[PDB]
Structure formats: structure tokens, C-alpha cells
Design a protein around this ligand. Structure first.
Ligand code: ATP
Ligand code: ATP
Ligand code: ATP
Ligand code: ATP
Ligand code: ATP
Lengths: 362, 362, 362, 362, 362
């Protein structure tokens, strides 16, 4: 019998796989007999053991085929086609709800019976994040609500401050909570066109550590980053559709997404200042360093920079009414789990431990 | 049986779709059973539920096909070919008539019983816009005339007020009324070839926020936009037919379209200044800002910016005789529908609120 | 039955069509029934209504086909091959005779009863053009004879003078009379290879708006242009074959065509000036301005730009015996028609109206 | 009969071969009759004599085939697909454990009776290396742990010092021990995008000899290398995923791997220094130089720069319990062999010979 | 019957022909009857007259075939695959032995019964070459050893001195002896990437006449070669594998080969001077110039350029025991032939003639 190109496409759609070689590689693993499959018996990775039994008969015939990459390319095109349909037609509030449902699905597995992490350590993460800025939950609620409402010329937030201040730490967490991509505009102007092509159909972008000019009085090395941005004003404004590049494509036309710009304390033009609706002054704090020096499980597990940590913070601090009505059911269950496995006295103690510069679990 | 490539091309033309992945993604939705289709039950997106039953049989066979992107590329080529044929053979009045018809069809959808907006909020839009310039209604009709008559040299309009003065606000609204593209002449002259190539077959160009030099005493930052335009004089003049580099292909030959140039108050070289038929001196108005600070639904819904708002202004103010003969059947229904929903005192009350800087609905 | 590729190729040849999306677009229009086609009844476009009845059968089978763009690419290459053979094997006098024959076919269609032009406005245009330069009729024949004779390094003419002087108007008219292309060598050496890549197999070239240096005391801005032309001497001399280049094709070695250079009062280096046969010293004339301010149909209809006005002038001022013996038959029918529809006193009145700077038709 | 593409794909995965021409050439060597094969009789290369008999019948039919390169491209893509699966799903400890197994398999071949290597020269290498820096086996273990844990912003080590200080020697041995790629960031910005794309799916990267500025007071020539690294800060930080590109590919998005930077005593910006967790200052030593003048075999055989030498140092110095549990059985077997063939006093005499700057084997 | 693709591949293997058009052209010449081929009867070209009679029957079916360039590309990729198997699996001693075998095969033809060359004139060349430097046969042997051992960093030789000193003459002779390529790193810093890509799988690389800066006090013009070479240090050192690229291929990772740098008397950085294991200063000398004015056959037949002359020099001067054991038996037969056809007094008279600046054969 022949290969079913449809059954491959189902696997690609269900695993949301948009890399041709990753799809090829995993579909090849299914060729071996399911009765003995060691990865299935060891339960190693979700995207194998769920699917092998359904796909085995087709994977065996796929392994003989002469067209293997042409099958996978069509299957990957289908996943990209789905994403472009969704990006035009869904409301941004529903896109965020779709993103949260995937993050809650991760949280089920990580803290599950087949779990691999401790919820007490991740809540220690929340306590460290709440110390970084005054009214941390208000800032994160403002950020979500801004990215959902997407008001013209009030679309970008500026994160400013000296070295090792936590601006990247917060940006990276927001960039996993919301789906998005990072962009580096410190490169020269003639490559900039392909670089900005990564924003195609993305919900959020982060421009990381934009180098300025006039840094020499502060010992900061100068560069063209700030000057490249001031050539891109209409990409920031979002009033008009802009023609985004891609390799092996024509220009493709859309509103370029909202985002975060991070920089050191350079000067900024008035023309560029008119685009940023909000500015966050990140401060180095000596006591926050002394905590991490004793509590390194946070960084080895990448806790304080993951989007799962901010979702746990929103589950703790915000009312249920500010989640969209469909996900309120799952959010309520998670509030009951955090009320079960902690107390307010432990959480108040954890914040005190961080502020004292001792170990959070002390 | 085989896929009908003809039926796919009918959907592509009926939905005016010229992106290959978008056509692919939407056509795959039709493979599911029509009797259960939740998107049809919700009547959510027009270009789904009008078509599913007509195309369902062909989508079941397309789902098994091994040629999916090959089919859709030819369907997209057919839509692109129609647009080129039109661009050579239609008169500019027919093009603008076909453009107004498309807008009017969207007005029927937005303000219907399946509607999503209130026509008062958009007539509030007309009241806000009419304050921005003296006699806005007549400046629009002069711009429309100029783009239809396309007289050599007498082709471009210059918008050159100070910062944050509404030049983008009017430019984006005129851009959607007529159809066109924004172009980035501030990017590098060795790739500007592939930027101007976006103007192939288009009706308007807007050259967004052209940077000059010599404004630095007034804090205006330097850039090369003005020097690039002063190299493109034959493109602006529109006497001769110029050569446009369509990406990955050899050049097209055509008259580069008319359009709007937006800039801050830099100096313009005398050689370039002659290319502009008329100039608009925008300014900040503090009362107009405070009106928006209260009437926030105007910004959130993009009401002050969409071409539907200028068309409602044209429907309200101008004599029916200024519109081409085939749309006069539609305009007069909308004139009756506008006089039905509004009194003149209410509209004067809107404009009075704008001049006082209070909310337009107050 | 099956698609016949010969029939598509014949349509492309007869319409002299060399763009693939344009050929695809028009041939698709023939798929509908001939008995009721509005386009065939309205007589809108010649290249439709002449051809639908012949091709209906093939266009119906073409709409079912899966190789549509493959057929059109071979058909366009047949038209491109024909231009290659002609430009290698014809004499330049026969090339110009072929070009005049094509323009007379337009004149038949324009002034025949299905057209829309008024010949009184075109002969007013002839009267207006003759005032732009002294002895204009001699100059056109001197330019034409130069392009037919093509003596080495005596191949280019220089159009020079103040801004707003009609040099582009006359150059664009002379271009349409001859054929040819415009090139903008103010675009950078970073891309200049593909710019001169437009001159392949052309009869005439216009280098538009060439920027010099050292014009600041005359308020002229500087640029690269004159240094690019003075780097391109091997192209302007035309003694030897030069390796012209266009993307996704090999270089083709040929003699680069002769042409017109348009510039303001920049300095021209002594090495470059030795490439020009003669210069024309344009300057503004006040009466020509006040004439166009009133005879405004000239600019709107582009009458002073079109080569049809220059050809109607050559019909008026030159002997029959300057034209080739194959075309003299048509020329005498047109010469009779201009006497039958005018008089000498009417033409004298038109020129005097231009000299008075009033409306030409008065 | 016909070619089995499955048998080629087995050989490609067996030999872990990812160059298409290399695979093609080696598989063609199997076409000749096995009964007489000179390379098999001579045992010259494992990847031949192990595999010829299994593959011969398929190679005989493959040698007739008209599609040979297409077959080999599918076989190579299957091997890149495997690596793409491993890099996303394995732990970094498993990756290193797998890599050590590959090196231990080479040691069995090198020091078998079929192999050419002499263990005394390779242990002479270990003695020399342990003199280059204090506590070398602690430094190596610390580095290996740092690469496994991959802690954000604590990922890169800086090797600094004079000319001929041994920093390249030690980096090359580490780079073989845990497989990675060397990158040249001294070339201009416009080629960096392709060059940085070599890091896709690699465990480790080394930036060799990055040129700075301000060296001229110390005879060191300036370059842009340090400025380029100061633009790439987010690649060094590794907090967020960056967009990496090959030629003729779309981008791959991943965390850019940990690494080593080697440089001479140019100044480092304070923004860049914060990315480096540990700096090693190398120094020239006369006894090491004079020793290498006498034990020339070390340099001819490339012993001091090979990862096998560092693995031998780890086997001799580190406890078994520091190695991963699944290879402790192999390490114990090698520890027994080393104590069987060396005393400590032989090795202490080797180190004394090195400190004396006489020949290691004296 | 059909084309045997295997027989075309055999011919490509036996002629080492790795150009697609050359293979196509030569194989097409076999289609004519071999009974009366004049190139065969005149024995004009070995790659023809040896092979025509075997391939005639296949060339007749090849001449009718429609896939001719597809057959040739597979045949050429088979030769390229053989080279890449060899460059990894052979020892560098075998590579040089294989190269010397190929030169000896030419020499037997050149000096055979169909020989166009005269061994007297070529040994006149050996006499001239041995005068260019002291102890030339030891310089040559020291070079060969250095290339065969390829010791890290001790890899490159520098040829330095005034114009017309013979440094290119010796580099070209050593390049034809070993095989390899010449690279011009004076070309711009971006084209440099594909220029260096020519080194893939090569044995030698020769960098020709690299420009320094700061020589205008001694009439030597500035350039960028020495600044570029100081950026390529990791390629010269050969400690690490480096990334090499060809157009429309991704990078090949290998140790960049050893060889020779030729330069006039510019100053060299300490950083680059540390890479060179030996420097030769060449001085212009009058007697060699006056000899060549009378010994003109040397330049015309390119005798002093040729690796055949250096091999003849090694056969004359060096012991047999220095050559590899498999080639030694051919070396003995060539030593006998030189002692037969030259006495010592003939050769010593030639060296006296060179010193006298008279004709070598005088
Ligand atoms: N506010 C803070 N005060 C002190 N230490 C901090 C703070 N925030 C983060 N850190 C420490 O500094 C490390 C780096 O933080 P991070 O990269 O987020 O800073 P950044 O200010 O965004 O840096 P950069 O300017 O280099 O982009 C963290 O891993 C943590 O150990
Ligand atoms: N005439 C005006 N007076 C005051 N505020 C204005 C005016 N026009 C627009 N606004 C406010 O300024 C915001 C930005 O308007 P807009 O982008 O059109 O200005 P611009 O002058 O074109 O900007 P830029 O200087 O950035 O090119 C609007 O969203 C509105 O809030
Ligand atoms: N000789 C003239 N005297 C006065 N007005 C003129 C003259 N020639 C042209 N014009 C006016 O100037 C407009 C522009 O003409 P055109 O583009 O041919 O001028 P040009 O001198 O070639 O231009 P440029 O200075 O940009 O090279 C015309 O449409 C007409 O209205
Ligand atoms: N510590 C040392 N002391 C003396 N000589 C050394 C030392 N280390 C290496 N060498 C010698 O110098 C040669 C080059 O070593 P290597 O290339 O590793 O040095 P490096 O300091 O990294 O060089 P560079 O500054 O040129 O990049 C070695 O082959 C060895 O002969
Ligand atoms: N040692 C020498 N003394 C004088 N003339 C020489 C010497 N060697 C070669 N010649 C003459 O100089 C000519 C050029 O030699 P060659 O090109 O090898 O010199 P070069 O020093 O490498 O030159 P350049 O500096 O131009 O690269 C030879 O063909 C020969 O005629």
C-alpha cells in the first residue's frame, strides 16, 4: 500500500510542528514495533508515546518511500497555513486565551503524576519576581491589556536601565507568556530587511539591548541601533500596513506587532520618545543578588524567566473575573491547588527571605 | 475522482485572495462535514460560510491530494493576472468606482443586523475629522480629482507640518479610501530597488515620514530620505515610464503612481519642491487632543483613521452629482439611511463638543 | 480534446505581448461564450474583441489545464526571441519604418469613428511644440537621421538648461517616436549593473536627470551621476561591444544604443563632452507657460508629450521623399487628410495664439 | 531488481555521515566484488571493511542507477533529522555521555593491535598539559560542568594572554572533547549572519582570536571583532531564542550554545565583560617551549591539542563517581588498563622532565 | 538499447575530468566512426585516441539522448566524490606519491618517441633554477617535508624581496609539483569568502603578491592584503577546522591547507610573523637576466615555471632513499636515463654558462 500523506499531516497539526527536519525525524522513530518500544515503555517525551500506536502502520510504509521530504514539506506548509488563517481572523483576546491554554497544558504535565518539578520552587520564583518592581501584578496586567487592545501609536513599552538590572529577565518572561519573537536591530541597515521579516504573524516582539550614541560620558559603547529604530517609525506606529520580507517569498503586508524595547541609559530622540507609551526604570538591587547567590535552583531551572512563573503570579494576585470566560474554569482549579499546597504565612515568609538576602526556602 | 483546479480558482477569485498560504489554509477548512460546521452555525467569517457547501465535495478530494501548493499557486497566479489586466485597461474613474463599491459592501456588513458597530460612532468620526483642517470635505474632493487626472508633474501632495500633527492620520485615511501602499524611502539606496518595486500596478503611494537634513537646530534628526527622493525625480514627475524591480524577477516598465509625501519641517531642495502640486501645513490643536482623551472609542476602534469614515463624510456632505453614475444607486440609499439615523443638530452638537474638547457622545 | 500551444503562441505574437501575467490574464477572458460577451459588444479594447471568436475553443480547454503558466512562459519567450532576431538582422531604417507603421495603426484607431480624439487639439499641439526650440522640424530630422546613421562616438545629444524647460517633454516625445528606454544612473554603483541591463536590444536611450557636482553657485544639488557617466565611456562611445547583464540570465555582449542625456547646468568634464555630437540649450518661455495655463487639455491628454504629435508634425513640415518607399503610401493618405481637415490660416492662428500665450483653440 | 534506499539510509546512520559527496564516494567503493577487496584485506578504514559485505548486492545495483545523488540526499537528510531530534530532546548530560562513548570507541581502535597509537606518547601529552595551568583537571571538570548546566549569562569563558601562550591549544582539545564549531567574528557585519548560522544544533562554540582596538601601544593591530561581539550580546547571554540562518534555508530558532572566547590583551567593554563568568590568563613558559623542541612527536601527531588527551587526564585524575553512571563501567575498565601499564613514578618522572625542559621520554 | 551511464562515468574516472562542459564536448567527439578519425590517426591527444574505440558504440546512443547534461553532472559528481574520499582517507605521503606518479606519466609522454620536448632543454632549466637560491634541492626537499608533516602553526613559508626576484617563478614550480591553487586575498573583504572557498580539498594554497601598507617611501603602494591575512589567523594556524563555502552550497568544514605567501618588502605584524616557519629573501641578479636574454626557449616553453623541472632536479640531486618505496622503482629507471643522456661535464658546463650570463647551451 501507499503512504497516507493525510496521516502525516494530522501528526504535524497535532504536534504543531513547523520544522521540516523535526517532523521527519520524529515520524521516522515510529517505524519500529510498538510492542517493544523502549521510549514508550520509559514514557520519555509526550510527542512520541501518545502517537506511536496510531501511526506505526503508516510510518513503516513511509520508511520505505522515495519521497520522504516532499511528504514532510506539504505537512509543514499545512501547519503554517493554519497559523496565517488564525492570525487574520481571531480576536487578539482569543489568541491570548489560546496561548494560555497551551501553557496550562504544560503546567499539568510538569506538576503532574508523571511530573518533573516542584510547585514550591516555582512559587519561590513568583516571590522573587514580585520583589523586582513596585506593584508587579499591576504592570503585568497593564501589559496584557495593552497588547490585547493594540491602540495606534501607543503600542510599545521601553525598558531602560544600567547593566544587570533585570530588564531582560522581565522581558523574557513576558515573551513566553505572550507568544512572540526577539529581534536584533544593532546589525547594519542593508541586512535589516530580512531581519524584520521574522515578525510575520507574531503577536509580540522584543528588541533586545538597542545600542545608542552619546554613551561615552557613561562608559557605554556606541552603535547605530537607536538610529536604525528612528528609520522604522511607521513600523512602531502601527497606523499603516508595512511590507515584511521573507527569503523565498515576495514582500508580505501587515501591521507590525506591539513590543518591548530594552536599552541602557543612552539619549533617545524626541521623535522616538513619542512612540513609547510607558517607560520602566529598572534598578540594580543588592539584596536581590544575595538571594540568588544562595538559591541557585532558580537559575539552573530557568524559573525567574519563564512564562509559567508569571502565569502562576497572575493566578495568585488577580481576580478570576479578569481571565476570559472560557479559561475561568481552568483558572479556578489552579487557584484551589495553590490554596491547597501553600499558605499566606509561607508566602509572606518567602518574600521576607528574599528581602533579607537569604535563601528563599530558608 | 480528481481535484477540480477550476473550482479552487473560482473560490480564489470570488474571495480576491492573493496569498498562497492563506488560500491553502482556508480551503482545507471545507473538508469537514457541512451539517455540523460550527463556523457556519455562528456565521463568523463571511468568506467561510458563504462558500462551504459549494466547495465541500472538492475539499474532500483536495485533502487527499499530493499537489496542494501547486494547485494554490496557480489559483493565486490567476488572481494576480486579473489585477494586472485591470491596471492597464480600466480608466482611473472605473478603478475608483470599483474601490468605492468594495468599501460600500463592507459598510453593508458592518452596520447590518449581523453587524458589529454603531453608525453613530462613525458619524462621530466624521465630526472629529472635519475639525482637523479647514473645509476637509473639499480638500478630499480635490485630492480625489488630482489622483484621477494624474497630470504630469502635477501628481504629488506634500504633508509637512510639525511632529504629532495628524499628517499620518489623514494620509492613512486617504490611503484606505483610494487603495495604495506605504513605501520606506528611508532604507538603504542599494536595496531601495526592491522597495519601490512594491508600487507595481498600485493606485496611490504614500512615502512615509521622509527624513531630511538641516533641521537639527530644531532637534529634527538627520537621514537620507530626501536625498533618495531627489534621485527619483522621474518617478515623481510621471512623464516617462520607469523600471521597477519585482523581486526575484526582471523589471516591469510603467508610470510610477501618484501619492502623498509626509515629513517633518525639514528643508526641501528646490529641485524636489517643484514636484508637489499642493502643500498642507498641519499643526497641533490642543482642543482636538482633549476631545480624544475623552472620546477614547475613536482611537480604540480606529474610527478617525479608516477610509469608511471619509466615505461617510463624502456620503454626508457632497452632492450626488460628483459620484460616478453606477454608484449613484447605492449612495442615495446611504444618504437616506444617514438622514434617517441623524438630525443636523445632533451632528452640530458633536462638532461643538470637539471644539470644546469634550467627549463626542457627551 | 487537448490544449493547443500553437494557438496561444499566435495570440501572443499578434498582440506582441511579452509579460506572462498579462498574457495569462487576457487569454483567460476568452473562456466565456462569445454570443453575449459585453466586452465584445461594447468594443472596449481591440486586443479582446478581435480575438475572442477565434480562440474560444482553446480558451475553454485552457481553463481546465494544469500547466497554465508553463504555456504562457513559452509563448512570451517566442515573442522575446522574435525581438532578438529582428534586432540582429534588420537595418535601422527598417526598424524605424516598422515603428512608424505601428504608430500609424494607432492613429487610424484614434481618429476613426470608434476613437475619441479631436485632431484639432493634436495640431494645436504641433503648433505648441514648434515654439519650444528654434527650427524644431529640422532638429527632429537631424536627430532621426543621426539615430539611423549611428556613426561611432557621434551617437549622443545633450539636453541642458534651467529647471522647467520642457527638455523631458521633448525627450519623452522623441522617445515614443523612436521606441527606446529611460535610464536613471543616479542610482548607485551598488546596483548600476542591472540598470544599464535595461538597454538590451533597444533603439534609443534617455539618461534622465543626471546629477553633477559644482553647481552650488547656481543652487543645484550634487550627486553621483556625472561621475557614473564619465566611468561609462565605453558605453557612450559605441565602437565596441559591451557585456550587458540582466538577472537570472547570462551576460549578452552588444553595442550599447545611442540616446539623449538630460541635465541641469552642471559642469561636464572635457573627457565626457567629447562623447556628444551637439547640445540643445533649453530655457523657459513665459508665453508657453501662460498658454498651458489656458490650453490645459494639452497637459491633461499629454498631447505635447506624445510622439503622435511629433509624427503629425513630420507629416506637416517634411517632404514625402524623406520617408521610406514602403510607408510613403500611407503618408500620402495622411497628408491629404490634414489638408482636408485644416487650412494654413488655422495653423497660423494656432501658432500666433501660442505666441500671444492665450488658448490655442481661440 | 532495484536499489533499496533503506539500506543506504542504514549506512549513513551507521557512519553518522552528513556530507553528500562523501557518502556517495564511499558507497561506490562497495560495488566491486568482496572476495578480493584490497582495502578489506589491509583493514585500512573501519567504515569500509565493517560494512562492505552487508551492502555489496545493493551497491552493485546502485552503480547502474540514474538517480544516485537524489538517493544520497535523502540519506543525509535522515542523519540531520536525527541530530535535530537529539538536540531538542536529550539532556545535555546525555549528549556529553553519548559524545564520550564515541571517543572511547576511537580509543579502542587506536590502542588495539590493529591500531597505530603508542600509549606512552599520549600519556606524555597528559604530563605536558597538566603543567600549562595550575590544577588543570579541576579547570577541565569545572568547564565541563559549566557547559552541562548552561546557566543563563554564566555561560562563556575568556582565554586571554600573550602570543604563543597555548590558549588555542587548550581550546582545540576542549572543542574535540565536547564537539562544537569554531567561528570567525573578525570578518565584516554583512557576512556574520551566515557565519553565526554554523552554530545550529552544536553543543559548544569557540570564537578564535577576536581582534579589538587600542592595541597599538603594545604592537597589537586593531580590528572590529570586539565591536561585533558587543552587538551580539543576546547570543552570549542565552536568555532568549535567536534566529539563525543557512544559505538556501529558512531560519532556525534556538538558544545559541555556550562557548570560549580567545583573545590577546585588547581592552574589553564593561558591557561585554559581564557576559564572561571566568577569565584564564595564559603565560608563555620557557621549559614548555624547550621541551617541545625535543619531543617533536607531540606536535607531529597532534597530541597536546587532542580531546583524547584531556579524556585520558580525566580518567587518570578524576574519581569514577564524577562520571555519568552509564559509562562508569567503561571508565573502570580504562583505569585498570592505565595502572596496568604505568606506575606513578614513571608519570612523575615525565612531569619532572617537562619542568626541566628536556625531552618528556628521557 | 539505451545510454549506459556507467560507461560515461568510467571515462570521467579515467580522465579525472571534473568540468561538465569539457566532459560533454570530449565524449561527443566519439560519435563518429573510429575507422577513419583523423585525431586518432594523427594521435593528437591521449584522452581521445586511447579511448575512442572503446566508447564509440555508447557515444552513438549518447548523441541521440535527451538527458545529456544530466548524464554528465552525475559523471562529474562521481569524480568529485572520489577526491573527497581521498582527501580524508589517504595519508599526505600517499597524496604526494600519487601526484608524483601522475607527473612521471606526463614525462614519459613528453620525452617518448612521440615526444615534443627535449630533455636537454629541460635540464638547461634545472641548471638555471639551482642558481636562483643557495642549496635549492635542500630548500625544495625541506618544503616537501613541511607540507607532508603539516605540523600545527609550523605550516607556512614566506617568499620576500624586490620585484622580478623569481618568487612567483619558484612558487609556481612548487605549486605544479604538489598540486593546489592560488588565491588573491587583495580583493574586497566580502568577495573574500568565496575566494577562500577555492581551497576546499586542496593540498597547497599559494597567496600571491599580498599588498601591505606604508611602502610609499620605497615606491610600494598600499593595499589591504596584510590586514586581511591578519584576520585569517585561524585558517593559517591549522589547529582547528574552519568553514569553507561554494556558491549554491553550504559550508565544508576542514583544516585549511598549508603553503606559500609571496610579498614585496612591506612590514609584517608580529602576530602574522609568528605564523611563518621560514622566510626566503630573493635578490635580483644580473647574470640570470642576461642568460635569459640568450636562452629564450626557457620562457617560451615555460620550462622554469614547471613542476616537471623541479622533479627532474630532485631526480638528479637527491638520494633514492628519500622517495616513497612504491615510486622508487620508476625513480631508478629515470636516474639511469639522465646518466645515459648527460655526462656530469655537460651539466657543470651549463652552470658555468649561467654564471657567465651567456646562453645556457653555448
Ligand atoms: N534588579 C536586579 N538587581 C540585581 N541583580 C539582578 C537584578 N535583576 C537581575 N539580576 C541578576 O543579574 C542577572 C542578569 O539579569 P538580566 O540579564 O535580566 O539583566 P539586564 O539589566 O536586563 O541586563 P543587560 O543590561 O545586560 O541586558 C540575573 O541572572 C540576576 O542574577
Ligand atoms: N492635529 C492634531 N492636533 C493634536 N493632536 C493630534 C492631531 N492629529 C493627531 N493628533 C493626535 O496625535 C496622534 C498621532 O497622530 P499622527 O500619527 O497622525 O501624527 P503625525 O503628525 O502624522 O505624526 P509623526 O510626527 O509621528 O509623523 C493621534 O493618534 C492623535 O491622538
Ligand atoms: N519651455 C517651457 N517654458 C515654460 N514652461 C515649460 C516649458 N517646458 C515645459 N514647461 C512646463 O513645465 C512642465 C514640466 O516640463 P518638463 O518635465 O518637460 O520640464 P524639464 O525642463 O524637462 O524639467 P526638469 O527641470 O525637471 O529637467 C510642463 O508640463 C510644462 O507645464
Ligand atoms: N605556554 C606556552 N609556553 C610556550 N610555548 C607555548 C605555550 N603554549 C604553546 N606554545 C607553543 O606555541 C605554539 C602555538 O600555541 P597556540 O597556538 O595554542 O598559542 P596561542 O597563545 O593560542 O596563540 P596565538 O596568540 O597566536 O593565537 C604551540 O604549538 C607550542 O609550540
Ligand atoms: N633572481 C632573478 N634575478 C633577475 N631576474 C629574475 C630573477 N628571477 C626571475 N627573473 C626574471 O624576472 C621575471 C619575472 O619573475 P617573477 O615573476 O617570478 O618575479 P617576482 O619577484 O615573483 O615578481 P613580482 O614582484 O612582480 O611578483 C622572470 O620571468 C625572469 O625573466
Amino acid at each position: 500500500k501507499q503512504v497516507s500523506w493525510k496521516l502525516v499531516t494530522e501528526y504535524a497539526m497535532e504536534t504543531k510542528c513547523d520544522d521540516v527536519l523535526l517532523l521527519l525525524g520524529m515520524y521516522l522513530e515510529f517505524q519500529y514495533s510498538f510492542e517493544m518500544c523502549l521510549k514508550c515503555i520509559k514514557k520519555e517525551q509526550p510527542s512520541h508515546y501518545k502517537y506511536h500506536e496510531k501511526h506505526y502502520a503508516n510510518a513503516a510504509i513511509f520508511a520505505d518511500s522515495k519521497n520522504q521530504k516532499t511528504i514532510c514539506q506539504q505537512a509543514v506548509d499545512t501547519v503554517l497555513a493554519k497559523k496565517r488563517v488564525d492570525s487574520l481572523q481571531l480576536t487578539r483576546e482569543q489568541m491570548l486565551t489560546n496561548r494560555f491554554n497551551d501553557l496550562l497544558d504544560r503546567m499539568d504535565i510538569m506538576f503532574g503524576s508523571t511530573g518533573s518539578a516542584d510547585i514550591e520552587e516555582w512559587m519561590a520564583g513568583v516571590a522573587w519576581l514580585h520583589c523586582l518592581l513596585p506593584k508587579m501584578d499591576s504592570v503585568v496586567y497593564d501589559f496584557l491589556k495593552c497588547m490585547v487592545y493594540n491602540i495606534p501609536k501607543k503600542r510599545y513599552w521601553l525598558f531602560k536601565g544600567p547593566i544587570d538590572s533585570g530588564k531582560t529577565t522581565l522581558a523574557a518572561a513576558l515573551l513566553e507568556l505572550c507568544g512572540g519573537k526577539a529581534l536584533n536591530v544593532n546589525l547594519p541597515l542593508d541586512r535589516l530587511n530580512f531581519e524584520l521579516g521574522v515578525a510575520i504573524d507574531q503577536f509580540l516582539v522584543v528588541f533586545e539591548d538597542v545600542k545608542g550614541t552619546g554613551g561615552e560620558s557613561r562608559d557605554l559603547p556606541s552603535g547605530q541601533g537607536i538610529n536604525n529604530l528612528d528609520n522604522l517609525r511607521d513600523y512602531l506606529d502601527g497606523s499603516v500596513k508595512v511590507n515584511l520580507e521573507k527569503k523565498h517569498l515576495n514582500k508580505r503586508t501587515q501591521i507590525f506587532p506591539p513590543g518591548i524595547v530594552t536599552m541602557n541609559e543612552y539619549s533617545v530622540p524626541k521623535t522616538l520618545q513619542a512612540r513609547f507609551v510607558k517607560q520602566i526604570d529598572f534598578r540594580p538591587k543588592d539584596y536581590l543578588k544575595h538571594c540568588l547567590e544562595r538559591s541557585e535552583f532558580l537559575l539552573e531551572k530557568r524559573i525567574i524567566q519563564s512564562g509559567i512563573a508569571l502565569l502562576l503570579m497572575l493566578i495568585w494576585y488577580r481576580p478570576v473575573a479578569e481571565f476570559a470566560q472560557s479559561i475561568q474554569s481552568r483558572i479556578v482549579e489552579w487557584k484551589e491547588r495553590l490554596d491547597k499546597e501553600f499558605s499566606l504565612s509561607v508566602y509572606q515568609k518567602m518574600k521576607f527571605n528574599v528581602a533579607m538576602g537569604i535563601g528563599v526556602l530558608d
